[PDB]
Amino acid sequence: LSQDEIDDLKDVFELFDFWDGRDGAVDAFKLGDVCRCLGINPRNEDVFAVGGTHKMGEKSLPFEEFLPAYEGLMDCEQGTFADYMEAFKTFDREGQGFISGAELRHVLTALGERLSDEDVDEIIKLTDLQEDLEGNVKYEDFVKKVMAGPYP
Amino acid sequence: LPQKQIQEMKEAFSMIDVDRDGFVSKEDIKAISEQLGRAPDDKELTAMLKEAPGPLNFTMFLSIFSDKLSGTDSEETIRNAFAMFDEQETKKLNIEYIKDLLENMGDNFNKDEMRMTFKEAPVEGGKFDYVKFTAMIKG
Amino acid sequence: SDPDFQYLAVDFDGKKNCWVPDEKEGFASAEIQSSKGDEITVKIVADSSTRTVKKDDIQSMNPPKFEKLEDMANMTYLNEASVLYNLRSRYTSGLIYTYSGLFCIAVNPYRRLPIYTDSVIAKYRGKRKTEIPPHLFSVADNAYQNMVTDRENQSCLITGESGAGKTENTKKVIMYLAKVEDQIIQANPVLEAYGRFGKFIRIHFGPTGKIAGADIETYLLEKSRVTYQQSAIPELNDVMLVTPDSGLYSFINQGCLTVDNIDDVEEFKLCDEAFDILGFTKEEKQSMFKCTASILHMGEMKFKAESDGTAEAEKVAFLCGINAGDLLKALLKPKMNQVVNSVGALAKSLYDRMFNWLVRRVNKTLDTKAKRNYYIGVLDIAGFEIFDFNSFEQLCINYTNERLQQFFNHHMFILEQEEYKKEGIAWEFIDFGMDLQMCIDLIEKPMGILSILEEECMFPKADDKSFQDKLYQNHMGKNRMFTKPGKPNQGPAHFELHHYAGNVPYSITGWLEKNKDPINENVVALLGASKEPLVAELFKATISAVHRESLNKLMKNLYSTHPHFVRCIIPNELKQPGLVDAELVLHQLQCNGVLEGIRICRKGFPSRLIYSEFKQRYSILAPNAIPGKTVSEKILAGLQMDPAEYRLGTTKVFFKAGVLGNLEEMRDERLSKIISMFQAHIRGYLIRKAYKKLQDQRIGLSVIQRNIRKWLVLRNWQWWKLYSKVKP
Ligand SMILES: [Ca+2]
């Protein structure tokens, strides 16, 4: 895991354990967001597997039990550009790297581990994704931003 | 230190130092208190003085008073730590919000800390004005 | 929205959902709940009940992608439950035609449909099967194009159970080919009035592609309905000697008398009218009518052997132009029951010879000596059938269907092998019809079943036991297709035969007379020199033996053409449109060989894919290896796919059976993840984005928290208190 990366876990653990009342313990319901800060993006299915919880209060955790949750959420699969490009192609009848807003919305909110309607309008606005006159968007661009990061 | 703050301190020490002997004694405090509002009990007066190593000349006076008002941030520095939760920049915090922050976040307050704090707080229309309250708590 | 296509054009967890056996529906839509070795516990989607089912009794299903599919060969799963579901789906919606490979399926509508109009025929002309909805016209239209371009004879064997649609569809084919002559169409009314026989009619074509002649062949006319029937032009009356009452003659009032929607009055007139147009001299057509009326009379002759009158036995001799004396004579003491049964032997033999003669004659009218190129035959006969009790009649039908099977197989063998040749797949391999031959031989070969029976008839001594023993004597243990009767209203069984579409327990009682007849060779002499000119010809100068030569004729014929099989199905036993009985339908599936077509398919490659459409659908299964025929070479390579479960191809990929269903599994299960991973990526981006605002606030809160606790404790300071007090 590298000492430096354990120090990093430490760093972040604090910012969190503090906000849900500083006491050297973090709500297991945040274990996701914690690791999401250290780069990684596990899947909800992923997080619960190691210890995460559906609600706050349910339970809190020390840094001692935290180390392995992150050891865990590391060996979990992440998606490449190829993969995101592949899957998105299966919704393109034209084949020219397009899609409509409405449909893209459907893919995100309706298929796979759904995404609230808020996170969607969110990332849309963040990445500043824009549609043309016909109301379509180049899914290639979008995937690239999301992949980029909030600060590129 | 500061001047104007001193000018008062002295004139004060004067009104407090009744037996006009340039020193503050258990009788000095008890004396003036009663001439105004209820005064402290012996125990209060005792430990109230024990707070000053030796005799209370206008020096050990200004000393303990200055060591009280020491370790404080600006009215600007605080008004910002506040606007740090005032996204829209409205110069007001929604009461349920602030109460929530202080109550169970960071260094959780307690019900008393909570009551003592809001007994004064300027909340009217659901919104708790942190400007007016930053002043009240400061200058 | 076109009126012409109203009843012609079509309007899930791959691991939970499956097909589980049912008693009412044949198969039920189930969703698995829990495994337990072999005991799977599923939930019925319909009633929502629960039950267990052997694991090896579960069948795989098809995704909503193939709802009411027009061609079933294009379905992922072709199992008795996917097929029955597709048909029944279409059927209850008006669509009664469906393809499945090279086979067309017709489900009896039991109601009139506006799909045969001239409007509709216009649209099917010269259309290629994939171009337009499934229809019988398409099958006919295509056979035409093939005969033309390929320059060879075509042929349609329309099969199915009794009451399925064999006849109706045969007629629509001719009516079709005729629309894109008058006597031809007119041969049906007379043959239908008189007929319970197999029909093969060839329609010849000339150098300009027009009808230039036609002939008819018939097979095994019954014969039994004449005198027995299970429950359910006045001028001529004196010529036939009949009293216009049908319920008067035993031989025709056993079962029914009248027939909802058949006017015997008008049909008689039209039948008479048709004899004229056919060019039948008045004597000829009165010879017919009399011989048939005789049968009625032949059955009025009472007895005691000695006679019990003579009135009715004369009318008979009269109409057949022979001496009533010389008759009853050669009938009671050939040179009480042996007689009444030879009476029937005569009736039957006349009518057959009759019905037989009738056909020969209608072919006369038709063999125009014009110039013939190629032809298009149409076969309307009997397919496999297993009843409670099976005898000689069935063995004959079954033996027939067996040789037909080899044909249907063969065509597929030929056909299949073209693909692997076209594509470049490697599988010389051996032919297929090859299984089957054991049964064919058991029945037809030199010492076969029939040959034994045939040599057993020529002996007057023989009986049902020397025949039965002489059989085991030859094949018991010397041929595995021949097996002692097994276990079950299943009437007697003396042996069993393992037919392509079923195991049949045959009762050989009475097989000796069935095969050899018994009219007084005496009366055949009387009639041999009768006065009536027709009767004289009918008796001028065994079943199995005739049928042998017969079947071989039809086969060498069929093997010189291009086959098209049409399977008819009787959706139900109650004759009502749109209702399906699953049990009945299902039954056909086996013995109908749609199930045989699937089998033969599963032994090779069923599902075929053009790399262009394959790459597009299965790239998402190894995208970290894709920089159309090589891309797939990669994907399927990446997946570390067994070289067995698939094959090369020039333009297309060949996946063994089931495999494609399983790729849609992955191939799907894979696309979901990726979608999640990009949602995870979106979840992680939004989180990390809001990482700053959480540090600043962490400080901005510590200010307020520590700086209020100060102003709080400063107010709880006596000094300050008292100070504040002095203030003024
Ligand atoms: Ca905490």
Q: What is C644-702 written as a DSSP string?
A: TTEE--SSEEEE-TTHHHHHHHHHHHHHHHHHHHHHHHHHHHHHHHTTSHHHHHHHHHH
Question: What DSSP designation does B58 have?
Answer: H
From the list C279, C291, C300, the residue with the least C-alpha distance to C322 is C291
Q: Is residue C479 part of a domain?
A: yes
Contact B12 C712 (CB under 8 A): no
What residues of C are in contact with residue B12 (Cβ under 8 Å)?
Answer: 723, 726-727
The CATH number linked to C118 is 3.40.850.10
Separation between Cα atoms, residue C456 and residue C464, nearest integer Å: 10
Q: Is C358 helix (H, G, I), strand (E, B) or coil?
A: helix
Q: Say which of A33, A86, A112 has its CB closest to residue C619.
A: A86
Q: Assess whether C701 and C722 both reside in one domain.
A: yes
Distance from CA of B8 to the nearest CA of C (A): 8
From the list C550, C568, C560, C556, the residue with the least C-alpha distance to C157 is C568
Q: Assess whether A88 and A142 both reside in one domain.
A: yes
Q: Which chains touch A (3 or more CB pairs under 8 A)?
A: B, C
Contact A40 C684 (CB under 8 A): yes
The CATH number linked to C410 is 1.20.58.530
Contact C709 B113 (CB under 8 A): yes
Q: How far is CA B18 from CA C190, C641, C673, in A?
A: 146, 103, 84
Q: Which structure tokens are listed for C334?
A: 């050939």
Separation between Cα atoms, residue A148 and residue A78, nearest integer Å: 14
From the list C556, C604, C570, C584, the residue with the least C-alpha distance to C101 is C604
What technique was this entry resolved by?
X-ray
Q: Assess whether C66 and C129 both reside in one domain.
A: yes
What residues of B are in contact with residue A18 (Cβ under 8 Å)?
Answer: 106
Does C166 count as an annotated binding residue? yes
Q: Assess whether C61 and C148 both reside in one domain.
A: yes
The CATH number linked to A28 is 1.10.238.10
Q: Assess whether A96 and A66 both reside in one domain.
A: no
Residue of C nearest to B9 (CA): C723
Separation between Cα atoms, residue B24 and residue B11, nearest integer Å: 13
Separation between Cα atoms, residue A49 and residue A31, nearest integer Å: 11
- Please list the residues that pair with C44 across neighbouring strands: C30
- Hey, is the C-beta of A21 within 8 angstroms of any chain B C-beta? yes
Which positions ≥6 away from C579 have C-beta within 8 Å?
Answer: C571, C572
Q: Assess whether C480 and C592 both reside in one domain.
A: no
What is the H or E stretch that residue C706 is in?
Answer: helix C693-713
Sign, CA torsion C615/C618/C619/C622: negative
What residues of B are in contact with residue A21 (Cβ under 8 Å)?
Answer: 104-106, 108
Distance from CA of B125 to the nearest CA of C (A): 22
Q: How far is CA C95 from the centre of its chain?
A: 16
Q: Assess whether C614 and C716 both reside in one domain.
A: no
From the list C566, C557, C596, C558, the residue with the least C-alpha distance to C412 is C596
Which positions ≥6 away from B38 have C-beta within 8 Å?
Answer: none
Domain final position from C509, C539, C569 = C509
Q: How far is CA C480 from the centre of its chain?
A: 28
The per-residue b/e assignment along C391-400, b for 16 or more CB within 10 angstroms, e otherwise, is bbbbbbbbbb
Q: Is C217 helix (H, G, I), strand (E, B) or coil?
A: strand
Residue keyed to tokens 């190629």: C374
Ligand 1 centroid to Cα of residue A70, in Å, is 18
What residues of A are in contact with residue B103 (Cβ under 8 Å)?
Answer: none
> In terms of DSSP H, where are the helices of A20-138?
31-37, 44-50, 63-72, 81-89, 101-110, 117-127
What residues of C are in contact with residue B116 (Cβ under 8 Å)?
Answer: 712
Q: Which structure tokens are listed for B49?
A: 């003085």
- Hey, is the C-beta of A140 within 8 angstroms of any chain B C-beta? no
Q: Assess whether C130 and C162 both reside in one domain.
A: yes
Q: How far is CA C333 from CA C117, C302, C336, C342, C522, in A?
A: 61, 16, 11, 12, 9
From the list C499, C289, C265, C301, the residue with the least C-alpha distance to C399 is C499
Q: Is residue C285 part of a domain?
A: no
- Kindly list the protein residues that place their beta carbon closer than 5 angstroms to ligand 1, a single-atom ion: A 17, 20-21, 23, 25
Burial classification of residue C695, based on how many CB atoms lie within 10 Å of its CB (0-12 exposed, 13-18 middle, 19 or more buried): exposed
Separation between Cα atoms, residue C499 and residue C403, nearest integer Å: 11
Do C26 and C41 form a contact (C-beta atoms < 8 A)?
Answer: no
The CATH number linked to C642 is 3.30.70.1590
Domain final position from A53, A72, A91 = A72
Q: Assess whether C479 and C562 both reside in one domain.
A: no
Q: Is residue C544 part of a domain?
A: no
CB pairs under 8 A between A and B: 11
Q: How far is CA C65 from CA C75, C77, C101, C213, in A?
A: 9, 12, 18, 47
- Please list the residues that pair with C201 across neighbouring strands: C216, C378
Separation between Cα atoms, residue C617 and residue C611, nearest integer Å: 10
- Hey, is the C-beta of A81 within 8 angstroms of any chain B C-beta? no
Largest Cα span, chain A:
56
**Total number of domains in chain C:** 4
Q: Assess whether A68 and A97 both reside in one domain.
A: no
Q: Assess whether A22 and A60 both reside in one domain.
A: yes
Q: Which structure tokens are listed for C541?
A: 């100068």
Q: What single string gives the DSSP state of each residue in C586-617? A: HHHHHHTTHHHHHHHHHTS--EEEEHHHHHHH
The per-residue b/e assignment along C191-223, b for 16 or more CB within 10 angstroms, e otherwise, is beebeebbbbbbbbbeeeeebbbbbbbbbbbeb
Q: Assess whether C136 and C17 both reside in one domain.
A: yes
What residues of A are in contact with residue B108 (Cβ under 8 Å)?
Answer: 21-22
Ligand 1 centroid to Cα of residue C201, in Å, is 92
From the list A128, A126, A147, the residue with the least C-alpha distance to A137 is A128
Q: Assess whether C701 and C640 both reside in one domain.
A: no
Domain final position from A11, A41, A72 = A72
Separation between Cα atoms, residue A110 and residue A103, nearest integer Å: 10
- Hey, is the C-beta of C683 within 8 angstroms of any chain A C-beta? yes
Q: Is residue A152 part of a domain?
A: no
Burial classification of residue C614, based on how many CB atoms lie within 10 Å of its CB (0-12 exposed, 13-18 middle, 19 or more buried): buried
Number of Cβ within 10 Å of residue C132's Cβ equals: 18
Sheet holding C153-160, edge to edge: C97-100, C103-107, C561-569, C153-160, C374-380, C198-205, C211-219
| C153-160 and C607-610 strand pairing | unpaired
| C482-483 and C652-655 strand pairing | unpaired
- Mind listing the domains of chain B with CATH numbers? 4-66 (1.10.238.10), 75-137 (1.10.238.10)
Contact B106 A20 (CB under 8 A): no
Does C167 count as an annotated binding residue? yes
Q: Assess whether A95 and A39 both reside in one domain.
A: no
Q: Give CB contacts under 8 A, 24+ apart, made by C139-145.
A: C139/C104, C139/C173, C139/C564, C139/C566, C140/C173, C140/C176, C140/C177, C141/C176, C141/C180, C142/C564, C143/C376, C143/C562, C143/C564, C144/C177, C144/C180, C144/C376
Q: Assess whether A7 and A67 both reside in one domain.
A: yes
What is the H or E stretch that residue A25 is in?
Answer: none
Do A147 and C688 form a contact (C-beta atoms < 8 A)?
Answer: no
What is the H or E stretch that residue C728 is in?
Answer: none
Which positions ≥6 away from C451 have C-beta within 8 Å?
Answer: C444, C445
The per-residue b/e assignment along C331-356, b for 16 or more CB within 10 angstroms, e otherwise, is bbeeeeeebeebbbbbbbbbbbbbbe
Residue of C nearest to B83 (CA): C700
What residues of C are in contact with residue A30 (Cβ under 8 Å)?
Answer: none
Domain limits for position C138? 3-180+558-602
Do C215 and C363 form a contact (C-beta atoms < 8 A)?
Answer: yes
Residue keyed to tokens 């899947």: A43
Number of Cβ within 10 Å of residue C292's Cβ equals: 18
Q: Assess whether A28 and A53 both reside in one domain.
A: yes
Q: Is B130 helix (H, G, I), strand (E, B) or coil?
A: helix
Q: Is residue C56 part of a domain?
A: yes
Q: How far is CA C649 from CA C335, C425, C638, C640, C659, in A?
A: 75, 6, 18, 18, 17
Which positions ≥6 away from C307 have C-beta within 8 Å?
Answer: C301, C313, C328, C332
Separation between Cα atoms, residue C416 and residue C601, nearest integer Å: 9
Q: Which chains touch B (3 or more CB pairs under 8 A)?
A: A, C
Q: Is residue A151 part of a domain?
A: no
Q: Is residue A87 part of a domain?
A: yes
**Total number of domains in chain A:** 2
Residues of B at the C interface, defined by Cβ within 8 angstroms: 8, 12, 15-16, 29, 32-33, 36-37, 40, 44, 48, 51, 64-65, 68-69, 71-73, 77-78, 80-82, 84-85, 101-102, 105-107, 109, 113, 116-117, 137
Does C160 count as an annotated binding residue? yes
Burial classification of residue C235, based on how many CB atoms lie within 10 Å of its CB (0-12 exposed, 13-18 middle, 19 or more buried): exposed
Separation between Cα atoms, residue C21 and residue C29, nearest integer Å: 9
Q: How far is CA C198 from CA C120, C381, C725, in A?
A: 30, 5, 127
Domain final position from C485, C509, C533 = C509
Do A143 and A98 form a contact (C-beta atoms < 8 A)?
Answer: no
Which positions ≥6 away from B25 have C-beta within 8 Å?
Answer: B19, B49, B56
Q: Is C707 helix (H, G, I), strand (E, B) or coil?
A: helix
Q: Assess whether C457 and C503 both reside in one domain.
A: yes
Domain limits for position A104? 81-146
Q: Is residue C430 part of a domain?
A: yes
Separation between Cα atoms, residue C687 and residue A39, nearest integer Å: 10
Do C60 and C665 form a contact (C-beta atoms < 8 A)?
Answer: no
Q: Is residue C650 part of a domain?
A: yes
Do C139 and C101 form a contact (C-beta atoms < 8 A)?
Answer: no
Q: Assess whether C502 and C406 both reside in one domain.
A: yes
Q: Which structure tokens are listed for C112?
A: 């009139």
Domain final position from A48, A72, A96 = A72
Q: Which structure tokens are listed for C223?
A: 């014969």
Distance from CA of C704 to the nearest CA of A (A): 14
Separation between Cα atoms, residue C648 and residue C654, nearest integer Å: 7
Q: Assess whether A91 and A59 both reside in one domain.
A: no
Q: Say which of B65, B77, B137 has its CB closest to residue C708.
A: B137
> In terms of DSSP H, where are the helices of chain B?
4-16, 26-34, 42-49, 58-66, 75-83, 95-104, 111-118, 130-137
Q: Which amino acid is at C156?
A: C
Q: Assess whether A36 and A96 both reside in one domain.
A: no
Helices A81-89 and C659-689 pack at an angle, to 10 degrees, of 120
Q: Assess whether A103 and A66 both reside in one domain.
A: no
Q: Assess whether A57 and A90 both reside in one domain.
A: no
Q: Assess whether A49 and A86 both reside in one domain.
A: no
Q: How far is CA B135 from CA C425, C545, C560, C722, in A?
A: 89, 122, 109, 22
Q: Assess whether C13 and C79 both reside in one domain.
A: yes
